[PDB]
Amino acid sequence: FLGLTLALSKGRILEETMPLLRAAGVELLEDPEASRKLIFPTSNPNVRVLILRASDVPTYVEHGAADFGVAGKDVLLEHGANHVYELLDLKIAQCKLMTAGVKDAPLPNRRLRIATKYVNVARAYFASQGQQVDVIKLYGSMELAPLVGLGDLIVDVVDTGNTLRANGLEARDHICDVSSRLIVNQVSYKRKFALLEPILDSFKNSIN
Amino acid sequence: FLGLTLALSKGRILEETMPLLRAAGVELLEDPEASRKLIFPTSNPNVRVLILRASDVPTYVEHGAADFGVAGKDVLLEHGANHVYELLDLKIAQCKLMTAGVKDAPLPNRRLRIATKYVNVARAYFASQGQQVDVIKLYGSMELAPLVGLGDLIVDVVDTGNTLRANGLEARDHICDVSSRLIVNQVSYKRKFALLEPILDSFKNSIN
Numbered sequence: 001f002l003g004l005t006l007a008l009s010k011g012r013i014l015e016e017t018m019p020l021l022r023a024a025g026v027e028l029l030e031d032p033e034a035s036r037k038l039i040f041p042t043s044n045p046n047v048r049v050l051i052l053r054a055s056d057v058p059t060y061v062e063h064g065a066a067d068f069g070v071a072g073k074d075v076l077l078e079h080g081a082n083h084v085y086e087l088l089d090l091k092i093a094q095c096k097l098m099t100a101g102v103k104d105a106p107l108p109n110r111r112l113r114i115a116t117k118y119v120n121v122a123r124a125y126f127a128s129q130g131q132q133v134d135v136i137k138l139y140g141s142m143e144l145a146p147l148v149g150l151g152d153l154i155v156d157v158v159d160t161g162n163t164l165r166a167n168g169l170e171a172r173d174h175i176c177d178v179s180s181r182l183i184v185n186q187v188s189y190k191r192k193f194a195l196l197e198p199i200l201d202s203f204k205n206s207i208n
Numbered sequence: 209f210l211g212l213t214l215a216l217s218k219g220r221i222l223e224e225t226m227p228l229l230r231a232a233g234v235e236l237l238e239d240p241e242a243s244r245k246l247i248f249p250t251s252n253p254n255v256r257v258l259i260l261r262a263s264d265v266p267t268y269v270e271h272g273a274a275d276f277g278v279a280g281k282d283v284l285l286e287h288g289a290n291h292v293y294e295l296l297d298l299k300i301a302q303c304k305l306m307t308a309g310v311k312d313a314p315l316p317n318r319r320l321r322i323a324t325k326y327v328n329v330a331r332a333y334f335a336s337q338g339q340q341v342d343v344i345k346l347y348g349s350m351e352l353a354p355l356v357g358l359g360d361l362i363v364d365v366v367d368t369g370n371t372l373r374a375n376g377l378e379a380r381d382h383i384c385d386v387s388s389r390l391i392v393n394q395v396s397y398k399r400k401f402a403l404l405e406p407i408l409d410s411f412k413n414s415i416n
C-alpha cells in the first residue's frame with residue numbers, strides 16, 4: 001500500500017471526521033464501531049483508515065505507521081507534538097481541560113496530589129500557577145479519585161460538566177480549550193504531498 | 209465508610225472474582241457492567257467495590273484508596289508491586305505474556321522496536337535475553353502494530369492465540385504465566401486485619 005494511512009479514534013472523533021472525509025471524496029465502506037477489524041479501506045483506493053485508541057494516534061503518526069491523523073489537543077499536549085506537524089484545527093470534539101475537586105472541599109495543608117491521565121499537562125499547569133504538585137497517573141474514570149481520597153484534585157476534559165456534577169465535583173480552573181487537530185508525519189508531508197494536498201485543502205474548505 | 213474497599217476491573221476479573229466473593233458472603237446488588245456508577249455496595253455492609261480500569265487497580269490499592277484488589281500479574285509486573293502485598297494467586301484470568309511478530313517475518317538488522325503497553329516487562333525480558341531494545345508505548349490493539357510496521361515485535365497477553373492468528377501473527381517467546389492476584393494495601397493489612405482475615409481465609413479455601 002503506497003497511499004495514505006489515516007489514524008482515527010472511535011466515538012466522537014470518527015463521528016465528527018466522517019463529514020469532512022465525505023466532502024473530500026473519502027467514505028468508509030462499513031461502520032468501524034461494529035467491527036473487530038482495525039484497518040479499513042475507503043471509497044478512495046489511495047486512502048485507508050486505522051482505528052486506534054485516541055492516545056495511540058500521535059504515536060502512529062509520529063512513527064510513520066500512519067501518514068496523518070486526527071487527535072485531540074489534550075492528547076497532543078500530553079504526548080508531545082514536536083515530531084509531527086499540526087496543520088489544522090478541525091474545531092471538532094470541542095471541550096476544555098480543567099482542574100476539578102469535591103464541591104466546596106478546602107485544599108489540604110501540603111503539596112497537592114493531582115489524579116489524572118494528563119500528567120505532563122497537570123505538572124505544567126500547576127507550575128504556571130507557582131505550585132509543584134505530586135501527580136498520580138490514572139488511565140480512566142478521573143471523577144472517582146477525589147471521592148475515595150486518591151488525590152485532592154483531578155485534571156480532565158470537561159464539556160457539559162455532567163460528569164463532574166453527577167459525582168459532586170466542581171470545576172476549579174480552566175486550563176485550556178481543546179479541539180481535534182489534523183496532524184501529519186514530517187516525512188509523509190514531504191514525500192506524499194501530492195496525495196495529502198487535496199485532502200488538506202478540502203478539510204480547510206469544509207471547516208471554513 | 210470504615211469498612212473495606214475492594215478494587216476490581218470489568219470483564220473477566222469481575223466475572224471470575226464474583227464466585228469467590230459469594231463464597232465469602234459478599235455479593236453485588238446489581239451488575240456493574242450495566243451501570244455508569246463506580247462505587248457499589250454489597251450484601252455485606254463492611255465491604256464495597258470500586259470498578260476500575262485494570263491498570264488503575266494497583267494504583268488505588270498502593271495509595272490506600274482501596275484496601276485490597278484483584279490485579280493481573282502482568283499489570284502488577286508492569287506497574288511495580290513493591291508498595292502493596294501480594295497475598296494470593298487466585299488462579300483466575302489465566303494467560304501468558306509473550307512476544308509475537310508477523311508469521312515467518314525475519315528480524316531486521318538493527319536494535320529491535322517492541323510495540324507494547326508492557327514497556328517495563330518488555331525491556332526486562334529482552335535484557336534477560338541479552339538485548340537492549342527500543343520500546344514504543346501503546347495503549348491498545350497491539351496486534352495492529354506489526355502489520356503497519358510500527359515495531360518489529362509486540363509484547364502482549366495471549367490466551368487462545370486467536371487474536372494473533374486472526375492478524376497473521378505468531379508467538380515467538382513465552383515470557384511468563386499470568387493469573388490474577390489478590391493484593392492488599394500495606395497499612396490496611398495492619399489496621400483492618402480483622403475485616404480482611406475472614407475474606408482472605410475464604411478466598412484461600414475457595415481456590416484450593
Ligand SMILES: Nc1ncnc2c1ncn2[C@@H]1O[C@H](COP(=O)(O)OP(=O)(O)O)[C@@H](O)[C@H]1O
Pocket residue numbers: 009010011012013053054055071072073074075093094095157158159160178179180
Ligand atoms: N465530553 C466530550 N466532549 C467533547 N470532546 C470530548 C469529550 N471528552 C473528550 N473529548 C475529546 O475527544 C477526544 C476523543 O477521546 P475519547 O473518544 O473520549 O477517547 P478516550 O476515552 O480514549 O480518551 C478526547 O481526547 C478529547 O480531546
Ligand SMILES: Nc1ncnc2c1ncn2[C@@H]1O[C@H](COP(=O)(O)OP(=O)(O)O)[C@@H](O)[C@H]1O
Pocket residue numbers: 217218219220221261262263279280281282283301302303365366367368386387388
Ligand atoms: N484473553 C485473556 N484470557 C485470560 N486472561 C486475560 C486475557 N486477556 C487479558 N487477561 C488478563 O486479565 C486481565 C484483565 O484485563 P482486561 O479485562 O483485558 O482489561 P484491559 O483491556 O484494560 O487490560 C489482564 O490484565 C490480564 O491479566
Ligand SMILES: O=P(O)(O)OC[C@H]1O[C@H](OP(=O)(O)OP(=O)(O)O)[C@H](O)[C@@H]1O
Pocket residue numbers: 141156157158159160161162163164
Ligand atoms: O463534561 P462532560 O460532557 O460530562 O464530558 C466529560 C467526560 O467526557 C469524556 O468521557 P467519554 O464520554 O469519552 O466517556 P469515557 O471517557 O468515560 O469513556 C471524558 O472522559 C469525561 O469523563
Ligand SMILES: O=P(O)(O)OC[C@H]1O[C@H](OP(=O)(O)OP(=O)(O)O)[C@H](O)[C@@H]1O
Pocket residue numbers: 349364365366367368369370371372
Ligand atoms: O489469545 P486470545 O485468547 O485472543 O486473547 C488475547 C487478547 O485478550 C485480551 O483482549 P480482550 O479480550 O481483553 O479485549 P481487548 O484487550 O481488545 O479489549 C488481550 O488484549 C489480547 O488482545
Ligand SMILES: [Mg+2]
Pocket residue numbers: none
Ligand atoms: Mg472517552
Ligand SMILES: [Mg+2]
Pocket residue numbers: none
Ligand atoms: Mg481487555
